[PDB]
Design a protein around this ligand. Structure first.
Ligand SMILES: [Ca+2]
Ligand SMILES: [Ca+2]
Length: 279
């Protein structure tokens, strides 16, 4: 299948070179997989989700996304127009308030919730969790991410936007999950992206168009945006049977575009997420 005039990030993950505008993907499109977006919530009623999104848990007064951030990330995972895996099922877990903030205890609870809740869902091709959040180092937050991964969920997390070594941020610094940096449309490391040996992979993160609240769209930047590209790609690959939740991060790194990025510090991987599609 081919989506013409796609957002640049989608085109980039289906190309060996920058500058293309078509997103090439297998029609299966993540059908049968499930992605939990652990964030500010998801505007499930947005036409772009086609009824495939639902809120399953909130830690605040409402399950509504009053911010936009969660809806944007969910859109990059699985919206019709802006999504990597266009037929996946999306589950929203609201651990961040409408200002985009949350305590570590709540974020941890949200991860442990997903590890249990997945056992109640029909996700035959597998389960992914996308965490576009983080803050300073916490061994408890890292431990929760490790638990979620261990329970059989592919965990993708943002590297952070401090232009620093991600070793000092959580859950970015947990080695067992998939830590995602951001790149721009000219194959440069995004100027804000964290780096370091704990990074597993890069995805598109600068000027990413996706869904927003109020049934709208907008373009924003961050490692928050790169992370759902990788989460969606994992769901897509799991549906194709190419990999499993336990080894998807490794498989994505193995099959990535290598050496394409510039402004990568020595010691950080030069790997860009790639779906290896061939018609
Ligand atoms: Ca290349
Ligand atoms: Ca890792």
């Amino acid at each position: 299948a081919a989506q013409t005039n796609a957002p640049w990030g989608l085109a980039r993950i289906s190309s060996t070179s920058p500058g293309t505008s078509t997103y090439y993907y297998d029609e299966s499109a993540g059908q049968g997989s499930c992605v939990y977006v652990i964030d500010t919530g998801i505007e499930a009623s947005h036409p772009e989700f086609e009824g495939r999104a639902q809120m399953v848990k909130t830690y605040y007064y409402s399950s509504r996304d009053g911010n936009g951030h969660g809806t944007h990330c969910a859109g990059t995972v699985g919206s019709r127009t802006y999504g990597v895996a266009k037929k996946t099922q999306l589950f929203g877990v609201k651990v961040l308030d409408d200002n985009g903030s949350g305590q570590y205890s709540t974020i941890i609870a949200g991860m442990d919730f997903v590890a249990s809740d997945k056992n109640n869902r029909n996700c035959p091709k597998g389960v992914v969790a996308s965490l576009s959040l983080g803050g300073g180092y916490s061994s408890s937050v890292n431990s929760a991410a490790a638990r979620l991964q261990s329970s059989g969920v592919m965990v993708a997390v943002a590297a952070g936007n401090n232009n620093a070594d991600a070793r000092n941020y959580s859950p970015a610094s947990e080695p067992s999950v998939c830590t995602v940096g951001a790149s721009d449309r000219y194959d440069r490391r995004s100027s804000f992206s964290n780096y370091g040996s704990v990074l597993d992979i890069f995805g598109p993160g600068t000027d990413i168009l996706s869904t927003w609240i109020g049934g709208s769209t907008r373009s924003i930047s961050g490692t928050s945006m790169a992370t759902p590209h990788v989460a969606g790609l994992a769901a897509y690959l799991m549906t194709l049977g190419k990999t499993t939740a336990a080894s998807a991060c490794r498989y994505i790194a193995d099959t990535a575009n290598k050496g394409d990025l510039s402004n990568i510090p020595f010691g950080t991987v030069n790997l860009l997420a790639y779906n290896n599609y061939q018609a």
